[PDB]
Symmetry: C3
């Protein structure tokens, strides 16, 4: 030996570069919401950002199908799951002739965050279908006058599971069923995800103000619905090198 | 007496807490746009935020029905009120075969703001259907070169009416008809609503920059259309404890 | 002479006012995305702002028709260009029974920026249909782990063409074909456009923080599709006094 140490070192340097690039303030951080439906459908929403990733989904987008992702016949709503149905979710006994539970009302959600993220700072907020701040312990939803928009429970970091890519943790995932227990049965959501900083300089303000504000909405939001998780993982998540926990609790 | 002063005081403390919580920077502020249609339909858009609530509605969302709120048959546009119709609004005599005035073109709007808000700072901007800055006094719409994006008239605070919840003012409401007089006949809107601060520390910047920027889009926007105001008030506004002025000028 | 110098001077002062008003931090800056389709259709998206204009378009809005701009029959998708089609764009050979290239997949884009803009600071980012950061030189799309969200090539200022209104430059335009050469064949985009400042005070932060953040989303986004460029120019661009480069390279 050692006749190919230069090629080796070069590959080593390349690997180091890709793996550590995540900590760059100009790399991507990713927030993915995977909605799960009792017919096997999964609807993906994926946000990208550099310093801060924020967003939300109201019922119109929590449900399937919708104006963003029509079903295979170009329909954005289903019979029995249209306006009257939504009205019955907004207010108990406030609807009319519709299905009790929509086929297109998700039963669960996976929330995935990937990147060099300030994990502890992550906020995931649950609201009812009417935009009311939701509370655990059979407390129901809070009005606008009593509703705490930033609660201790929004910090979900400790409930999230570490997801590895090779030998390092790449991201964290949270799985929750919509059962009125640990989450609303017909929720809407808001979220905030923050860049982990390798220094003390505030890149959300000062000389960085103009780009910090712009970056909030200057990255397209990917979204689609897939016939099932298997297809979503092979055709989206894997090629993106987004980590994802499958139905069996495996990181894929 | 006084054998239940502890229960009394406790209820008193609870009431004080809910009523004053509104001034907390972590409470909710609410901005509601209620669009009114000549068929009795009201379309509600409700934004929530902590420090700053901003948003806008273009014609696609000013009209009914739309991709956000389809009619009872899953339709997002009506015959005679589709693309050619919109084209006739954008430019005088620029359309073709459509109704002169859409059933789904709103005739009026109520703008409601609720919370501990910096009332004087509120901005409501009117634009034409083509995004032109609209002007009063038969001046018409301004081009991009002459258009003032922040005008004295955007400060509508003095035209808004105080809306009480019990013995305190909870919010303010502005009612305007779309008649080319005090508002465009086919308007689009933009708005900015600001947290009233109980101190001098700028919570929109400095150490608060990261959360101030995130909070702009991290709360879901509620939206629906109701068959009439009566149903909207009993099934949405009242349970939310959002104040609202009805068709008779009454606070409900 | 000179019996009408007062009228002359007055017109002169008026002209000076309109022409220089663009440099006011309270004037408008405009960002227009014109998508071009092989059937002659052009779809316009026009953003307005004061200090910073940012936005993006995912495939749902890059394509025609969509939920924002339905075709003449109220349809938001076409046969053979619906969900399965989108799936074939997201992943090579990941779709099924659909047209190879949608009639509604744009073949080119004009990107126009107008106002007193910090021209050099302009960012236009290209992504693939799956939200992957796109690269030139047959390099393909980058994963989330390797993707550089702020690249040297996003600064397109030097590739843009000056567009005059009278004797001054009013804006700049960039024309690009979606051919996998200088742009993705099925792109999605994100952009950031910045106010040119006539002073050193940072109006994106400090005492200007609250309004800087709000202004990001407080101006409605105009959007429509026109049967062809000729109609779009006479009925939208010209009356708005937005400069625009036509199919012949002429400023109109
Ligand atoms: Ca308990
Ligand atoms: Ca007058
Ligand atoms: Ca080369």
């Amino acid at each position: 030996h050692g006749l190919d140490d230069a090629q080796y070192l070069q590959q080593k340097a390349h690997n180091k570069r890709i793996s550590e690039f995540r900590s760059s303030s100009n790399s991507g951080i990713n927030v993915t919401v995977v909605l799960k439906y009792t017919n096997g459908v999964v609807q993906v929403y994926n946000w990208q950002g550099t310093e801060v990733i924020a967003g939300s989904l109201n019922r119109q987008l929590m449900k399937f199908p919708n104006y963003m992702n029509p079903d295979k016949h170009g329909r954005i709503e289903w019979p029995g799951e249209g306006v009257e149905h939504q009205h019955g979710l907004i207010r108990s006994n406030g609807g009319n002739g519709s299905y009790d539970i929509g086929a297109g009302d998700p039963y669960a959600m996976q929330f995935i965050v990937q990147g060099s993220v300030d994990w502890n700072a992550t906020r995931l907020r649950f609201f009812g279908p009417d935009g009311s701040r939701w509370m655990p312990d059979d407390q129901g939803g809070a009005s606008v006058r009593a509703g705490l928009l930033n609660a201790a429970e929004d910090i979900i970091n400790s409930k999230m599971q570490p997801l590895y890519f090779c030998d390092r943790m790449a991201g964290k995932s949270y799985y929750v069923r919509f059962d009125d227990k640990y989450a609303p049965r017909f929720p809407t959501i808001g979220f905030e995800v923050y860049r982990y900083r390798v220094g003390a300089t505030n890149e959300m303000g000062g000389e960085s103000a103009r780009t910090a504000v712009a970056s909030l909405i200057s990255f397209p939001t990917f979204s689609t619905a897939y016939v099932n998780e298997k297809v979503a993982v092979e055709n989206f998540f894997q090629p993106r090198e987004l980590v994802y926990q499958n139905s069996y609790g495996y990181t894929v």
